[PDB]
Amino acid sequence: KRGPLAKIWLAAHWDKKLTKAHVFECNLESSVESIISPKVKMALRTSGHLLLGVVRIYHRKAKYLLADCNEAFIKIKMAFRPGILQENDFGDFGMDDREIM
Amino acid sequence: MMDSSTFKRFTASIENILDNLEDMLLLGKHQLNELGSESAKIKAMGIMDKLSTDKTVKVLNILEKNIQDGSKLSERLWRDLIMERVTKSADACLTTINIMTSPNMPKAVYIEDVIERVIQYTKFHLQNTLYPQYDPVYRQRVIVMLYNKVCDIVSSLSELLEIQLLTDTTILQVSSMGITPFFVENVSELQLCAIKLVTAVFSRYEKHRQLILEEIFTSLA
Amino acid sequence: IEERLHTLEEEKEELAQYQKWDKMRRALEYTIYNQELNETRAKKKEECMKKIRELGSLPQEAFEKYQTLSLKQLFRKLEQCNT
């Protein structure tokens, strides 16, 4: 929704609309999580929700970093040194639910 | 014709007076533009039958010209930039037409240095100025001017690459530059000139096919 | 990635040296075949003309400086360059 913490809301509630463009550099962890702790009138419930949100964000960042690193390492190992009736249900009793009267 | 030495005289006169007044610090856009327009149609056949080391020294001087924008890294300073850019691209056009235009020349009239220079020049200028202004994916009349210059350059360069053999180190750069255009939007004519370039490379040397296949496959997304 | 980057740097230096030697060989080959064209200016000789125009030994600025006229010291320099 709306706010400098909407991303964490989404990551804690819906998580599907959150795109690979959002996750990467939208939120500066060391600043946003720091913002969450002294924020005015924060209920414990919503705080727990936000905790799961920020942890999911961080986990996704880890996933992407691993994927890109693996891609790079696979690249670097390259070089160029030039030197009939088969299965029918038995009759119709399987699927021929009879008409009522 | 036999010689038809009147516009042959035009260009011979232009070249000798220019390298005399320079040799004894750049020629300027006008000289290059006129020499190029005479290289195109007049010297389509008239570039033969001239003095060899004369050509060697003048192409070396316009090479020293070319180097001025190789890795140039770029309300008045902007004007200075675009002046330098059009001057050097006209010059690049000049050198790549002069190397190729005749069906036959003596050997060693074109040394690989000017080759490498024009290649890296087109690479950097293209991939750092043309694609951003022509496509919002990566990112006034001077831009379209430079675009047309680059199309002429890559076509002529395709032909040159067809003529003679070359060394693999240049080939890697040429192949990367020629594979580049297929992945931005509004560059159709540049795309088909790049088709010509890449297919010439694929024709001649039977060791880079796998490299071109990989560099196509990698960026299909 | 660090280990592979190190080995890559080593191979880079080796490549620089090989590149230098290859430039030397190409210049020498071009010069001796030019002398053979001068010999052509004195069947087989048009054939060596075919050779020199075939090879496409891309000349470099270092060409004109290496002007030795023996044609036998030339051959030993070419053999060493080849090795």
- CA nearest to B130, candidates B217, B191, B67: B191
Pick from B50, B130, B40: nearest CA to B85: B130
Judged by a CB distance cut-off of 8 A, whether residue C1 touches chain A is yes
Q: What residue has token string 């516009």?
A: B7
CB pairs under 8 A between A and B: 4
A77: contact with C, CB 8 A cutoff: yes
What DSSP assignment string belongs to chain B?
----TTHHHHHHHHHHHHHHHHH-----HHHHHHHHHIIIIIHHHHTSSS-HHHHHHHHHHHHHHHTTTTT-----HHHHHHHHHHHHHHHHHHHHHHHHSSS---TTSS-HHHHHHHHHHHHHHIIIIIHHHH-TTT--HHHHHHHHHHHHHHHHHHHHHHHS---HHHHHHHHHHHHGGGGSSS-HHHHHHHHHHHHHHHHH-TTSHHHHHHHHHTT--
Q: Which residues of A44-77 are buried (b: 16+ CB within 10 A; e: fewer)?
A: eeeeeebeebbebbeebeeeeeeeeeeeeeeeee
CB atoms within 10 A of CB C28: 20
Longest dimension (CA), chain C: 61
Chains that touch A (3 or more CB pairs under 8 A): B, C
- How far is it, in rounded angstroms, from Cα A89 to Cα A97? 14
The C-alpha of A58 sits at a distance from chain C's nearest C-alpha, in angstroms, of: 24
What's the gap in Å between the CA of C33 and the closest CA on chain B? 11
Q: Please report, as a single letter, which amino acid is at residue B48.
A: M
Instruction: Tell me if chain A has a CB within 8 Å of the CB of C5.
Output: yes
Residues of A in contact with B172 (CB under 8 A): 80
Whether residue B180 contacts residue B127, with contact meaning beta carbons closer than 8 Å, is answered with yes
Chains within contact range of chain C (3+ C-beta pairs < 8 Å): A, B
**Nearest Cα residue to B95 out of B148, B160, B17, B144:** B160
CB atoms within 10 A of CB B137: 10
* Solved with: cryo-EM
CB B55 within 8 A of CB B109: yes
Which residue in this structure is represented by tokens 């220079």?
B117
Q: With contacts defined as CB-CB under 8 Å, which chain A residues touch B207?
A: 82
Count the helices and strands in chain C (H runs, E runs): 3, 0
> Of the candidates B149, B148, B174, which has an alpha carbon nearest to the alpha carbon of residue B161?
B174
Q: Quote the CA–CA distance of A7 and B64 in Å, as a whole number.
A: 55
CB contact under 8 A, C53 and B107: yes
